[PDB]
Amino acid sequence: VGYDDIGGCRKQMAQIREMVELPLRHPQLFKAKPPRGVLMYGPPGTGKTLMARAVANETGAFFFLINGPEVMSKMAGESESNLRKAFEEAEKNAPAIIFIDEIDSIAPKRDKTNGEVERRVVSQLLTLMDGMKARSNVVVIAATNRPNSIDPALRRFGRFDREVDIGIPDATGRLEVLRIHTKNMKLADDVDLEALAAETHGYVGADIASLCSEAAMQQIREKMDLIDLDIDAEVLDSLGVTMDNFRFALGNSNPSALRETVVESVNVTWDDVGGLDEIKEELKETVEYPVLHPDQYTKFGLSPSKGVLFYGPPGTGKTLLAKAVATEVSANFISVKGPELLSMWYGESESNIRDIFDKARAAAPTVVFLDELDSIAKARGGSLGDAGGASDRVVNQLLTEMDGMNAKKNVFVIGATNRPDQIDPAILRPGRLDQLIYVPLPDENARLSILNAQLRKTPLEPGLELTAIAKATQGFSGADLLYIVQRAAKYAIKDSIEAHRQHEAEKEVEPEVDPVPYITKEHFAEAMKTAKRSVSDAELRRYEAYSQQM
Amino acid sequence: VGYDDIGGCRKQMAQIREMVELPLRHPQLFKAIGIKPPRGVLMYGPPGTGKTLMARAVANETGAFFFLINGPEVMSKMAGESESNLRKAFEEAEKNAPAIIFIDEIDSIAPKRDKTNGEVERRVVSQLLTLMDGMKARSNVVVIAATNRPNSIDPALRRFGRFDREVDIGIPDATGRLEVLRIHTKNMKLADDVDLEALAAETHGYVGADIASLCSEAAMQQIREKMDLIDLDEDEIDAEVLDSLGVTMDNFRFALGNSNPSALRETVVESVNVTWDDVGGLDEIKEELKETVEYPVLHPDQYTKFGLSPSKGVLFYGPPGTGKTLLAKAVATEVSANFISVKGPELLSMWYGESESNIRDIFDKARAAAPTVVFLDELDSIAKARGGSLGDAGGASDRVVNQLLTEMDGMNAKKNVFVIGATNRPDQIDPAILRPGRLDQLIYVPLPDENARLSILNAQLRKTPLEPGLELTAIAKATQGFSGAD
Amino acid sequence: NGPEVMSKMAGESESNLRKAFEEAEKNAPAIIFIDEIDSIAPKRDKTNGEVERRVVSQLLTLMDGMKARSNVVVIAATNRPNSIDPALRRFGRFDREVDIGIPDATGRLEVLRIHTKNMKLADDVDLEALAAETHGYVG
Amino acid sequence: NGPEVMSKMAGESESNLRKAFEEAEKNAPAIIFIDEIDSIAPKRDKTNGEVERRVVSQLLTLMDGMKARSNVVVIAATNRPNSIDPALRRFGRFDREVDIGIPDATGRLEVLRIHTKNMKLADDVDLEALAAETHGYVG
């Protein structure tokens, strides 16, 4: 594993060569002073250990690995013996390079830890780092997964001067790592890595390797379950990973950051959302341009809106649009309902919102869906902070964590509320959640489109009409239309079951597909006798008043 | 045990079989494709589903040596001794042969490395991370882990290279329960009357060990019904009764009627004895409820043939005592699906967020042990119109109703959970809850008519001795505005 | 006993549990009685410490894991079953739950007869009237 | 004493109670006095900690259990009886709850006579009138 194995981090790699490689083989130009330690941080799985092994291999300097949590011992004070023996051997043998992995096990901030061996070893390590003659030129390599849990005493001049933020790669970096990992295996010709890198968004470093391995695994299963190979040279050499394997692996795999927040699959398409044509057009305009055409943003010089709020009467399709965005936008998506985050303990609520937004930034680009915002971002009001100011603290954390998203972050927040009156007006200020889409009640054509989209997978009578239903349902909603269709289906099922019962009765006393083949005129006629309007006129009046106020 | 003992999980069985067999059966094929296979898997799911059973089967079948690590077992009192235990285990496993590590109850060893405050714990987490990933991390070794709460694991452990694949050992389907029943009812002797297909059909939430318990209880009933005719026979038991036990279908029925799913053990409803004949009148309401509850659970082929979804919610409303709670009890006693009886204000709590936590737990249990029936008594107590309260406890009621809204309709699935509400004040219920798709059926239970009062009187006098010449038609004709309670 | 197992050293409560179970299993088919289990075995999700979670996991793996048990029966007693880890309320660990509830009139009569069988009672005693008039007595 | 037994380490307060009880039982028949028990043992269901639950369970097991006590008497003192675990207020743990309430006029008379026994008093003052005048004074 040489310098050519790590990819996607040319700039960050370039500093590493300058920081530790050039000043180690010639200290003359620096004297005509390089640090005695370099920190690397970033999300897990970013090639930290890979880079450390590549620098350890390419340079012939002696290498002495001390894994962080492996320096302690059971006997009295043998941890100190281990540490100073490591440093003395590193100095005495040669101008070596030492790599300390998982430093967090060695420097737990000295603020929460109340042990004694940890204090002794951290202070001794501080003294050792203090004692380093400029002529040896030995440097230490540190590797931390979480940078904020570090003893700040080490974060000072002379101790680990320059840090290097090994972040997530861009599209070009993802393509480069894809090539690096897939060059050894025999990849079939009918494959283009550019498309896989344009569709791969949150994967970092190791997840790409997982993707390739999974695709290969599926192909191996495809050529093992069917052939039933149960040694076979002809089977051995006839192995080639095609495009469908990579598509399947992409459809199955998930960024490691969003592993905990896996969402149940609800497959929706844009033809399922009947009506709302202009709303769908505006939503596409808002969401696909910032994520696919950065050149347009650069040319315009205007910051696109980074939020949107759906409001309207219940049963109009806010959650349906959220599902459609989650499924068919080609970007990450983390769904949250308001009350999930709150916790009885002190601090946990804010830690949870901070963690969720940290994950959102990690798997950038992302679409964080806040459903029913009327619970976590309620009006301040005169609640007196009876919960120790818990709600106030939660909303304050949400505001500070939503306003601190620059252009590079690329995190789009989707709002959806039934009652917009209880939303804190601070949220609706420009720069946080500026755009507000209003989802009105369907018109006759929208209702017809909804019915056609809901009856897509339903066997239906050839001699049937829906314009009558549309013309009849006047103040109805999408949920109401769903109720009509489900009731008609239930009547059809009842007829089918009773007909099958009768047929079996006089049979026991080849069957067709069913006694009742399709949804029928009479089924809809009887289903429409018990259809009642979902939302009354008072709510429509109040929503119209709110809309006109805007 | 063997691969023919684990039942109800075929996809996952193949997923672990692949990792355990192919890199130890056809290494040449993986050298030909070029890459190495994944070498880490995490088993997760509800307790008593078969993860540890699968680990045992793998240990028995694979011909390499197998090492088992219980979670807390590694830790010790001497400073830096757990680290030595982990290092010794991993090095011995690597040195001796290609092997399978099994980490049982990983939740004890990976407490998120961020919420913990013990130094030694974070030391053990970092040591495991180093052993599973780093310089010379692995040379032909694979690690399987088992957990019940995978979200309480450090994300650094849940990355490719350490734990590549997460297999979901979840609740089985009807076919899965049939397979489990056939597996567990092989060695025992059954009478011809037993029908395992019906047993699997009426079992609705039983998973693995639940089925095992059912079988054991049935056997216990057989032994405790066919020993009273004989004495204790403490010295010895004779062959004629030792043979011909024959666990009958009535024994299986009794054991199924006594038991409950392990998930709902905490919320078991007290037994109530009502019947459809106990509920007088309301013929249309009883038939509508019966068809709307029994159609999705008994006839799913028709629903999938039309490809639509069934109706879930229903709301009874009317004057008090008309028979709403009685209908709910009748459903609880008659319908085969599980029953979750919850009162209105039961789930509220003084703390912050614990009301919504309780609601989430109840609905998670309901969708876990599906098909399930959830009865929300007096919905107007917890689900009132939002914004009315001028002075509130930090808007806790609003948060509760929003939690109900999102859980009953949100980013979830339709696992056949039926919400029934019973309130006599439908004016206080928020309009959002009454939307179709959340509670679509609003059933009005009016005051009884002449024939309904007669039916009610006969229903209530079905177990009482009566005068031969007494007729109830006069009483019915004389009570005009009365209710069932009257 | 419930809190008898916990010690200040990190990793010693589970050692005590392991020693107890191995000693119980090494002998003839034995019975292990765990009194006041609400202390040893709370829900892991609701607790916030670490030693209790580790003890619960040790108990779980001892009760039902690879090489589960060998003719050893475990009995438990508690005043609150709802505050117990759901993984322990399972077949294999605690399959059967007996409900030792309040006695009825006949049960209370039996209790009176049992508790007044060794003392020097008078001739005037009718235990039936006492068992009738005592209503909510738990024994 | 109430809080004197509590500690910070896991499994130390229960060890203190065990040491106290075993030391008491090792010697001749003895009396134990748990002053201000309401601090040690509040209701289990209405507490958030874990050490308080463990020490409550330890008290329960110590006073009632297999081979509980032998010629050892336990006495308690508290000001808030209702804020105690109901499982503790049963026969075998605290058999009878004696109500040491305020005294009457005669009781106050004896209290005055007891307290004024060592100080030199003048003949004019009569303690009976003082006892009659005082109404709510206790001890």
Partner: peptide
């Protein structure tokens, strides 16, 4: 030789109260 020790004391919770207006 040295030795370690475990300790878990408590945390801090939050309550919610109800008020009456007029």
């Amino acid at each position: 030789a040295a030795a370690a020790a475990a300790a878990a004391a408590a945390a801090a919770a939050v309550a919610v109260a109800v008020a009456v207006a007029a």
